[PDB]
Design a protein around this ligand. Structure first.
Ligand code: MG
Ligand code: MG
Ligand code: MG
Ligand code: MG
Ligand code: MG
Ligand code: MG
Ligand code: MG
Ligand code: MG
Ligand code: MG
Ligand code: MG
Ligand code: MG
Ligand code: MG
Ligand code: MG
Ligand code: MG
Ligand code: MG
Ligand code: MG
Ligand code: MG
Ligand code: MG
Ligand code: MG
Ligand code: MG
Ligand code: MG
Ligand code: ZN
Lengths: 77, 57, 178, 119, 177, 134
RNA sequence: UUACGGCGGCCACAGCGGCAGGGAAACGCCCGGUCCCAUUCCGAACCCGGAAGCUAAGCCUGCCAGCGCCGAUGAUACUGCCCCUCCGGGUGGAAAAGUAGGACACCGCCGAACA
RNA sequence: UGCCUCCUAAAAUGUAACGGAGGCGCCCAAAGGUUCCCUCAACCUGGACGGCAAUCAGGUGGCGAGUGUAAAUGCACAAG
RNA sequence: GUUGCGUGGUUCACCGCGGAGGUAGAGCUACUGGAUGGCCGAUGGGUUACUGACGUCAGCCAAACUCCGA
């Protein structure tokens, strides 16, 4: 048998994606969209983070929107 | 950068052998540049086999 | 006051309005910059241009030039990125008019067997470029105290819109053409 | 053109520092607009886009100040210092407008710190 | 010339367009000079005959519940396997408007030598007014030598008709062998 | 027929479901063969149906093939257990959905061109028919 | 209220291009490099001091669908759930492309002219 | 045989096979922090040696270049 | 899964409202590749029946292509 296990390996899935959706009350510090890069950008009361994690700075409701093409994540305080 | 990096560029009297002269600014040490050909004493600024037979014969 | 600039605003400035029908006086062309470079490609090998190409354009043009580095690496020329290959000086203002004067008066008729610069050497816009072959054209360098010979090409950038509009400007300044 | 290059190259420097400096209702933004003859200034409050106070050199008070263009920059710096304290403003962020900090804009800001504003 | 009797659709959707086709009807819309579009049924077998003959442009005289209205045939939708008309688009014309219409192009002639007459399109888009003076545009190839390609120019277009496709559409090409 | 490069050498099987949406009409020629059912049409089957249309008209005409076999299939070695890898590519398949026009033809005579396209339906692993430009 | 100068909201229905017109204050080019400051070289730019020249360009206004952009209604593809041997059908959603068309943006605050 | 990226993976997350592709066991004292400034590749025209492509000047160019290193997500507002 | 003690509708279903997506489909002069027939033709080969780059006009395809998009 031809030992064609030349490619039999994978990394671990990193559980990315959006974690708190729109119209959802968050606390101060809650991680909203964990992601690679800035697929989503920080808006009002949202910080980016070290590995582009987009947490929360102030409690409130989460709403998504557009700001010159780049789509943003903001929190109404 | 416009302070004691650039060489000396002082005014310099230029003359020619024809007699033309003017006065500008150059890097020549001394100020006594002397040319032997200028833009007024140089050319281009101021401008058959059958015929050779009878010159022989 | 350089003698070619006050000659520019005396008859060259008015003779362009008869020859080309400009409505407004801000449309009259004027040379903006004169750019002089060596382009020493024999510095990827042996890397010696310090007294070579920097300390002679300082004597010819008037100020110290810019040691230009390479952009991409080319192996057929043995050229690697970030290696000095060109030496550029840019002339503006009063040192520009004192260079276009000193070129046409005492320098440019010292090309060996000179018969004129080609008037087809405009780039479709009105900017002129020609080349030289040695350093001894200019009297500010002495041939006894130099290294190997090297040449330069000279740009003359003008505000003109088309070729014959820019050809008429440099004709009145003192460039020969054939 | 030299005029079309200077307009695009200064509203690109102004949008660069606009990413990190907004100005709010309790801390407005002292925008400058420096030209060859005059300088303008206005506090903008970028939450509704509403100027709360403004000053310039096109008005007759600054026009009679003796001296050079730096000397007419100190007078317009003193005006908006006492036109912001007449509206409940004692701290602002400063906005270069895209220009380089120095000379006339620096003389405007040094005249607004000695007359009440606290940046 | 083309008398045609339509009716206004009761319910408009996926399930009702299938019930219309089993009853011998063709669903279509009638949108025009800025007015609101009508949603109407076609009688089926009669509509398939007033464009099998009389060309495919075929200015129709509709009868929308008594009211009279003229309309062109803009675009059909043919099923790829049944090859039957599914849906038509009709636009109205008020007795002369510079509409855009693609029209047939035929080839008339026989080439003499070893010549293969190849064609790249069977249609060019010409503009004209209402009831259609234009028809298929004959291109009389006289039997030329196989080196002369016939462009969208050198066309025998009638009067009152402009050619607005492009003046470089290769319509007839002749080559060797 | 074979491509000169493919980006991915070992691909999945192209899925045989759905009526075709492109290439459903005769575009270049006057007569054409329209498919009616799903099949993989290999490059041997096209080159056999090409030389049955050419060698029935024997001169003149023009034959279009607006179908290209660019999708590879794979094959294990002969006497092999399941699962030591995926096999090397053997065939070259053009996915043919119902409604797709396979071959096209321009010819002056009607009965010769129609009896030449029938001799290519018998070389293809589908049920087909001959359709005209209206 | 305006062939005005800023600052934003918005990010092509707004951009790109073509064609005409515009200078009261302003905006601009422009005139100079003594002064803080400046160029991997250059008062070109950045900066400062100016007001001899000009609307040529930027800018502003009017008009153009040309290249782009936006885009239904209808119909088909696809599909949740049921009935079905498949083919297909009932009910509930519904594109992409294309066509009719839209469109040379619209809105808020401050200053200057008018008022 | 552990870690990292894609697809399979059925539009959240997760998901197997001796399924389809590749990388890692580093490098950087600046390639880190900050402040300020800049816009590229490709192509067109002109230019001494100079060539398809060194350096120069001018057009056109909204991201096709670039990112220490694999791919994905990003990045021209720049993270270049 | 069962059972003791707590907690008490927090679970689940449907209708309404606010949300992120890149599958099916489709598209490709919107990118990376594959690719059929025309037209023009850089080079290459023997003045040019052979080669057909880059463009351009019609028709196409893709798990590791996406301007789109249920
Ligand atoms: Mg993974
Ligand atoms: Mg880190
Ligand atoms: Mg398709
Ligand atoms: Mg004025
Ligand atoms: Mg100056
Ligand atoms: Mg004008
Ligand atoms: Mg719809
Ligand atoms: Mg659409
Ligand atoms: Mg998933
Ligand atoms: Mg899923
Ligand atoms: Mg390995
Ligand atoms: Mg650093
Ligand atoms: Mg950087
Ligand atoms: Mg338990
Ligand atoms: Mg919903
Ligand atoms: Mg949704
Ligand atoms: Mg994907
Ligand atoms: Mg698909
Ligand atoms: Mg392609
Ligand atoms: Mg081709
Ligand atoms: Mg896909
Ligand atoms: Zn002389």
């Amino acid at each position: 048998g031809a030992s064609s296990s030349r490619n039999g390996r994978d990394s671990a899935a990193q559980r990315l994606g959006v974690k708190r959706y729109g119209g959802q009350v968050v606390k101060a510090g809650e991680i909203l969209v964990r992601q690679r890069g800035t697929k989503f950008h920080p808006g009002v009361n949202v910080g980016r983070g070290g590995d582009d994690t987009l947490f929360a700075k102030t409690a409130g409701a989460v709403e998504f929107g557009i700001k010159r093409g780049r789509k943003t994540v903001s929190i109404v305080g | 950068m416009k302070s004691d990096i650039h060489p000396a560029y002082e005014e310099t009297t230029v003359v020619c052998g024809c007699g033309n002269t003017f006065q500008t600014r150059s890097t020549k040490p001394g100020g006594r540049i002397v040319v032997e050909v200028c833009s007024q004493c140089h050319p281009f600024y101021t401008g058959g086999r059958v015929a050779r037979f009878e010159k022989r014969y | 006051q350089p003698r070619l600039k006050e000659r520019y605003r005396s008859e060259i400035r008015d003779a362009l309005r008869k020859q080309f029908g400009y409505g407004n006086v801000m449309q009259i062309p004027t040379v903006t910059k004169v750019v002089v470079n060596m382009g020493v490609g024999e510095a990827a090998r042996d890397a010696k241009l310090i007294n070579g190409a920097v300390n002679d354009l300082a004597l010819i043009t008037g100020q110290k030039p810019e040691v230009r580095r390479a952009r991409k690496s080319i192996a057929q020329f043995k050229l690697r990125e970030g290696m000095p290959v060109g030496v550029r000086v840019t002339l503006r203002g009063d040192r520009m008019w004192e260079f276009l004067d000193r070129l046409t008066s005492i320098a440019l008729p010292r090309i060996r067997d000179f018969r004129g610069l080609s008037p087809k050497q405009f780039d479709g816009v009105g900017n002129y470029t020609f080349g030289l072959a040695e350093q001894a054209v200019f009297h500010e360098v002495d041939v006894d105290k130099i290294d190997r010979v090297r040449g330069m090409d000279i740009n003359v950038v003008t505000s003109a819109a088309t070729d014959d509009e820019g050809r008429a400007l440099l004709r009145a300044l003192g460039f020969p053409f054939k | 053109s030299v005029s079309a290059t200077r307009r695009i190259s200064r509203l690109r420097r102004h949008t660069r520092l606009r990413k990190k400096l907004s100005g709010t209702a309790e801390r407005p933004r002292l925008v400058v607009h420096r030209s060859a003859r005059h300088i303008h200034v206005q506090l903008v409050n970028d939450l509704n886009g509403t100027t709360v106070a403004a000053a310039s050199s096109i008005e007759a008070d600054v026009r009679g100040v003796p001296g050079d263009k730096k000397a007419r920059s100190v007078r317009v710096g003193q005006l908006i210092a006492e036109r912001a304290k007449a509206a409940g403003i004692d701290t602002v962020v400063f906005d270069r407008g895209g220009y380089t900090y120095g000379g006339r804009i620096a003389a405007l800001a040094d005249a607004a710190r000695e007359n009440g504003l606290s940046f | 010339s083309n008398q045609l009797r339509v009716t206004v659709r009761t319910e408009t959707g996926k399930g009702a367009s299938r019930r219309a086709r089993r009853a011998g009807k063709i669903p279509a819309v009638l949108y025009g000079h800025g007015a609101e579009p009508q949603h109407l049924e076609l009688p089926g077998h009669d509509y398939a005959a007033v464009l099998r003959h009389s060309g495919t442009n075929a200015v129709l005289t509709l009868d929308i519940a008594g009211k009279e209205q003229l309309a062109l045939t803009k675009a059909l939708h043919i099923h790829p396997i049944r090859r039957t008309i599914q849906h038509a688009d009709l636009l109205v014309v008020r007795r002369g408007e510079k509409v855009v219409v693609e029209v047939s192009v035929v080839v008339e002639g026989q080439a003499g030598p070893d010549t293969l007459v190849t064609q790249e399109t069977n249609s060019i888009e010409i503009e004209a007014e209402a009831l259609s003076i234009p028809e298929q545009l004959t291109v009389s190839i006289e039997g030329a030598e196989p080196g002369t390609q016939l462009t969208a120019g050198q066309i025998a277009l009638p009067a009152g008709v402009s050619l607005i496709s492009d003046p470089d559409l290769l319509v007839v090409n002749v080559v060797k062998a | 027929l074979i491509p000169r490069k493919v980006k991915h050498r070992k691909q999945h099987h192209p899925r045989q479901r759905g009526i075709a949406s492109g290439g459903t009409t005769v575009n270049f020629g006057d007569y054409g063969i329209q498919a009616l059912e799903h099949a993989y049409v290999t490059n041997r089957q096209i080159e056999s149906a090409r030389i049955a249309i050419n060698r029935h008209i024997k001169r003149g005409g023009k034959v279009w093939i607006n179908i290209f076999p660019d999708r590879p299939l794979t094959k294990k070695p002969a006497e092999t257990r399941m699962g030591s890898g995926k096999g090397s590519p053997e065939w070259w398949v053009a996915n043919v959905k119902p409604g797709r026009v396979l071959f096209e033809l321009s010819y002056p005579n009607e009965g010769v061109a129609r009896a030449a396209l029938t001799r290519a339906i018998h070389k293809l692993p589908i049920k087909a028919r001959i359709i005209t430009r209206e």
